[PDB]
UniProtKB/Swiss-Prot annotation, chain C:
Organism of this sequence: Human adenovirus F serotype 41 (HAdV-41)
Domain-related comment: N-terminal amphipathic alpha-helix domain is essential for the membrane lytic activity.
Family label: Belongs to the adenoviridae protein VI family.
Misc. remarks from the entry: All late proteins expressed from the major late promoter are produced by alternative splicing and alternative polyadenylation of the same gene giving rise to non-overlapping ORFs. A leader sequence is present in the N-terminus of all these mRNAs and is recognized by the viral shutoff protein to provide expression although conventional translation via ribosome scanning from the cap has been shut off in the host cell.
Induction context: Expressed in the late phase of the viral replicative cycle.
Protein name as annotated: Pre-protein VI
Curated annotation (Swiss-Prot), chain D:
Localisation per UniProt entry: Virion; Host nucleus
Section of the entire sequence shown: 440 to 487 of 925
Induction, per UniProt: Expressed in the late phase of the viral replicative cycle.
Stated family: Belongs to the adenoviridae hexon protein family.
Note in the entry: All late proteins expressed from the major late promoter are produced by alternative splicing and alternative polyadenylation of the same gene giving rise to non-overlapping ORFs. A leader sequence is present in the N-terminus of all these mRNAs and is recognized by the viral shutoff protein to provide expression although conventional translation via ribosome scanning from the cap has been shut off in the host cell.
Protein name per UniProt: Hexon protein
Role played: Major capsid protein that self-associates to form 240 hexon trimers, each in the shape of a hexagon, building most of the pseudo T=25 capsid. Assembled into trimeric units with the help of the chaperone shutoff protein. Transported by pre-protein VI to the nucleus where it associates with other structural proteins to form an empty capsid. Might be involved, through its interaction with host dyneins, in the intracellular microtubule-dependent transport of incoming viral capsid to the nucleus.
The protein's assembly and partners: Homotrimer. Interacts with the capsid vertex protein; this interaction binds the peripentonal hexons to the neighboring penton base. Interacts with the hexon-linking protein; this interaction tethers the hexons surrounding the penton to those situated in the central plate of the facet. Interacts with the hexon-interlacing protein; this interaction lashes the hexons together. Interacts with host dyneins DYNC1LI1 and DYNC1I2; this interaction might be involved in intracellular microtubule-dependent transport of incoming viral capsid.
Length: 894, 50, 12, 48
């Protein structure tokens, strides 16, 4: 090029390519210890010509629907995706644009504490009213009325309105002390007897004035008086029928409401609390917003002529979970995006495996008075008989204080808030005297129901990795600690009426990253408008009942062409037009979907597949689901899907795939397929074998050393050569090891400690008297040792019998069809075997399950090739071939 | 509300007995020396070693 | 590998 | 409060026994490696 450039190697010759061959040899020789490759620039130059068009074409495109349609529960839009000529669109860039208004319902509360009176003593009166309350301000006179004199130019009084005794002003500006001396003037705002008297927490009261007053349609200066002295007005409390509210607070001991209308009386003893927090935001990768896997509302992508569809979906390829897996195996998932809403769900690993390690307190944690000395005693003079000094009141003895156990109390609060409230509804009690909604799902009820600290408070499985068994089978991601939901409902903001400008990708495999060719293409897709199935909530409460709505505004396709120079774009066109040059794709999960309903509470479940070819079968993968949270997406709507939380069906979530005791397989009646015996149990895939004389349980858990050779041997392809921890580049977020979790504790024996009791949960007594009896009540207790946790430690430890689980969540069991259970190829060794390639086989194969009283349904996959080939013969015509080798989606009968 | 009160209990097809331990009955079972067990209940999904 | 893509040991 | 407890809970307490002090009027085993002796010693927060 220009000589000045090549002189500086700006765009000249490659680093090693201009230096004398001797020096290149030298550097290539001594590079590990004396490297010289960093001292000479090697120029890099982008392609000069025929790489980007100059003919003034768009770099990004705007596509507006040709026709729209609004249904009571869905939204249909048909686009006109017409790529120009001598240009190529990669559909990967194409992504829908959504605008509208969303109402998250009253169940929304994106926080846990309370915004109101947030810090007061959560159990005591907004000065109420007969009389009872308080006064902070100080004065020199109270007038015939006029008020108490704030005082000024030879006169000045205050404003029953707000510049009254602004509830937060004070004599405070005295300090250590203040002392309403005979100032004859206390004063302050007391609520009036027509306004509910809720607790002092919560109390909101919409500002009504400007100066921050609180009244209604203007408040009256009463004039409570002396100290039993006489007419001598001393106090002028201002009374203010406010509009009390309490958004954010569910009471927890309304004393026996005298009647059905005491808005006042003695309820000055009502406690109150925060409301449980539920964030409510759109599903991860906007899972469910578009109509995937539902044949009814399937989309289309066909040339503008010959409207023959080119995207044909089924109910077995579960394209949502497949996409969510794809992000994992091709991303990190610990990196929040904002456009695809790519924030993965997650549970605080200190919440499902809570290690009650104990408190870290070793020191009294004290509470010293506000001045450093109270209750002093006046003394005076000296035995030298009172020289120049009723005054000088020195407090006697030693300071007065009272301690707190900060470290323990904070941990107790964490336990109650985090692994106490989310117990199954059975263990959760209702408050003493507050009515609850009849429906068991609405946020009003489950919020009103209150947990009990007695069940889980620093005396459960002490110092041992153990998820409270009642919490073992409950969903972990329906939790305010859910980082993904946490952020995603953090992102849209807070409160109601949240307008949303969202962008949704294309998750369908045959369209996900199809490379389009010139020609105009019609492109319509159907969007779920059902609120409950598109928004996540931390409590899994039904959303469409308690209140919610998503109104769509406009839906626009958006694509970004690559401005390739037409000179090369045309060659690429005629070049991908070739028959042999055809494209091809595949679904990532690449396997059928087979739900299997289990009886509400059952021990086992067999299944059967009539004789069928398994030409390219690869292996089975399965898990468990809770039927309350799996949507049958075979219809455009499902009125029976009341659950709102994470959906393991198609949201990557899996949290029960450890309750399987073991599985069995058998080909057509009797051909079991572990095989010509290989596994330690030659026919029974063992996963939760509970009693050993053979010692088949692997880790210190209660797995089996054949299952933990079938897992971690098809996932990480390790085994036969020593079980070593696998590197993170082959251990993804949804992998096996990442989520495996053993644990154990000891429980007091039942046949040895002949003093063994069965002291229930409302009859314990530990930490008694510094807590509340049953619920999150208040402290009316007493003191006498304790007697729940029978010491399993120290000198007087009792006998002990062990227990162990293997909590493994967010991972699916795999039983690869390969002969040796190795990842020897996508199309397995044994899959191509002659016997299975020429003569089909039926299948009978059954599972165990720990009995869950909540109805549950199975989940099984057959790891089936889902290939696709997409060809475009002429400008504007697209032809596709779908296939599923072992589970073909169509045969001679259609 | 479904009561099989007029049918021949067995319409639904039956499958081979799984043939493994545990699931053939749900009455209290006895251990080698006598320490009983639970047939299909919880506390049998935990590795209760000694 | 080999050339019908991936695999292992039907090639010595 | 919490930070002070943390310091004594973890760093102000693992000092060599020569810095720790036995409580006022309780007895300790003569063996210096037994638990009863090890915890019996109590560290002075002022030191850490």
């Amino acid at each position: 090029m220009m000589p000045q450039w090549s002189y500086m190697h700006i765009a000249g010759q490659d680093a090693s390519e201009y230096l004398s061959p001797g020096l290149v040899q030298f550097a290539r020789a001594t590079d590990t210890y004396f490297s010289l490759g960093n001292k000479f620039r090697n120029p890099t130059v982008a392609p000069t010509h025929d790489v980007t068009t100059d003919r003034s074409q768009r770099l990004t495109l705007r596509f507006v629907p040709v026709d729209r349609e609004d249904t009571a529960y869905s939204y249909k839009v048909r686009f006109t995706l017409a790529v120009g000529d001598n240009r190529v669109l990669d559909m990967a860039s194409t992504y829908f644009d959504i605008r509208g208004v969303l109402d998250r319902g009253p169940s929304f509360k994106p926080y846990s504490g309370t915004a109101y009176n947030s810090l007061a003593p959560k159990t005591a009166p907004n000065p109420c009213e007969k009389v009872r309350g308080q006064a902070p301000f100080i004065g020199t006179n109270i007038n015939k009325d006029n008020g108490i004199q704030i005082g000024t130019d030879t006169t000045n009084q205050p404003i029953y309105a707000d510049k009254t005794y602004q509830p937060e002003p004070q004599v405070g500006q005295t300090q250590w002390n203040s002392e309403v001396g005979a100032a004859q003037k206390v004063a302050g705002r007391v609520l009036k007897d027509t306004t509910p008297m809720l607790p002092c927490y919560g109390s909101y009261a919409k500002p009504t004035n400007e100066k921050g007053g609180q009244a209604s349609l203007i408040v009256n200066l009463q004039f409570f008086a002396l100290p039993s002295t006489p007419n001598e007005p001393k106090a002028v409390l201002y009374a203010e029928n406010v509009s009390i509210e309490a958004p954010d607070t569910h009471l927890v001991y309304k004393p026996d409401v005298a009647q059905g209308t005491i808005s006042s009386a003695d309820l000055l003893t009502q406690q109150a609390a925060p409301n449980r927090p539920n964030y409510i935001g759109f599903r991860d990768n906007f899972i469910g917003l578009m109509y995937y896997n539902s044949t009814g509302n399937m989309g289309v992508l066909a040339g503008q002529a010959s409207q023959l569809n080119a995207v044909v979906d089924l109910q077995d390829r579960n394209t949502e979970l497949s996409y969510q897996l794809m992000l994992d195996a091709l991303g990190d998932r610990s990196r929040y995006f904002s456009m695809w809403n790519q924030a993965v769900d997650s549970y605080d690993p200190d919440v499902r495996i809570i290690e009650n390690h104990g408190v870290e307190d070793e020191l009294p944690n004290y509470c010293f008075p506000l001045g450093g000395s109270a209750a002093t005693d006046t003394y005076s003079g000296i035995k030298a008989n009172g020289q120049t000094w009723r005054g000088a009141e020195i407090e006697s003895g030693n300071i007065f204080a009272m301690e707190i156990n900060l470290a323990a109390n904070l941990w107790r609060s964490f336990l109650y808030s985090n692994v106490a409230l989310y117990l199954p509804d059975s263990y959760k009690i209702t408050p003493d005297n507050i009515t609850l909604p009849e429906n068991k799902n609405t946020y009003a009820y489950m919020n009103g129901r209150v947990a009990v600290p007695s069940a889980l408070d620093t005396y459960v499985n002490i110092g041992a990795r153990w998820s409270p068994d009642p919490m073992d089978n409950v969903n972990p991601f329906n939790h305010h600690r859910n980082a993904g939901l946490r952020y995603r409902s953090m992102l849209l903001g807070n409160g109601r009426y949240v307008p949303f400008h969202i962008q949704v990708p294309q998750k369908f495999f045959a369209i996900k990253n199809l490379l389009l060719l010139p020609g105009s293409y019609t492109y319509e897709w159907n969007f779920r408008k059902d609120v409950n199935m598109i928004l996540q909530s931390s409590l899994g409460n039904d959303l469409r009942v308690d209140g919610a709505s998503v109104r769509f505004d406009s839906i626009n396709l958006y694509a970004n062409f690559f401005p390739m120079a037409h000179n090369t774009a045309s060659t690429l066109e005629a070049m991908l037009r070739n028959d042999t040059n055809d494209q091809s794709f595949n679904d990532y999960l690449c396997a059928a979907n087979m739900l299997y309903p289990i009886p509400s509470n059952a021990t086992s479940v067999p299944i059967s597949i009539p004789s069928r070819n398994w030409a390219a079968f690869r292996g089975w993968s399965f898990t468990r689901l809770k039927t309350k949270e799996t949507p049958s997406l075979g219809s455009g709507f499902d009125p029976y899907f009341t659950y709102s939380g994470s959906v393991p069906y198609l949201d990557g979530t899996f949290y029960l795939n450890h309750t399987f005791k073991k599985v069995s397989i058998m080909f057509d009646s009797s051909v079991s397929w572990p095989g010509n015996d290989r596994l330690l149990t030659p026919n029974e895939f063992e996963i939760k074998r509970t009693v050993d004389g053979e010692g088949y349980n692997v880790a210190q858990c209660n797995m089996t050393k054949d299952w933990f050779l079938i897992q971690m041997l098809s996932h990480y392809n390790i085994g036969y050569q020593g079980f070593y921890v696998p590197e993170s580049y082959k251990d993804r977020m949804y992998s096996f090891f990442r989520n495996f979790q053993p644990m154990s504790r000891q429980v007091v024996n039942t046949t040895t400690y002949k003093e063994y009791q069965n002291v229930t949960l409302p009859f314990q007594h530990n930490n008694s008297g510094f807590v509340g009896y049953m619920g999150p009540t208040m402290r009316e207790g007493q003191a006498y040792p304790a007697n729940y946790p029978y010491p399993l430690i120290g000198q007087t430890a009792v006998p002990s019998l062990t227990q162990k689980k293997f909590l493994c969540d967010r991972t699916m069991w795999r039983i690869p069809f390969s002969s040796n259970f190795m990842s020897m190829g996508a199309l397995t060794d044994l899959g191509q075997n002659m016997l299975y390639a020429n003569s089909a086989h039926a299948l009978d194969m059954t599972f165990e399950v720990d009995p869950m009283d909540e109805p549950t349904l199975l989940y099984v996959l057959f790891e089936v090739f889902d290939v696709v080939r997409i060809h475009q013969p002429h400008r504007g015509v697209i032809e596709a071939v779908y296939l599923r080798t072992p589970f073909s989606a169509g045969n001679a009968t259609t | 509300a479904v009561s099989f009160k007029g049918g021949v209990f067995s319409p639904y097809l039956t499958t081979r007995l799984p043939a493994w331990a545990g699931v053939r009955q749900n009455v209290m079972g006895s251990n080698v020396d006598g320490r009983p067990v639970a047939p299909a209940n919880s506390a049998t999904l935990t590795y209760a070693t000694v | 590998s080999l050339a019908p893509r991936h695999g292992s040991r039907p090639f010595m």
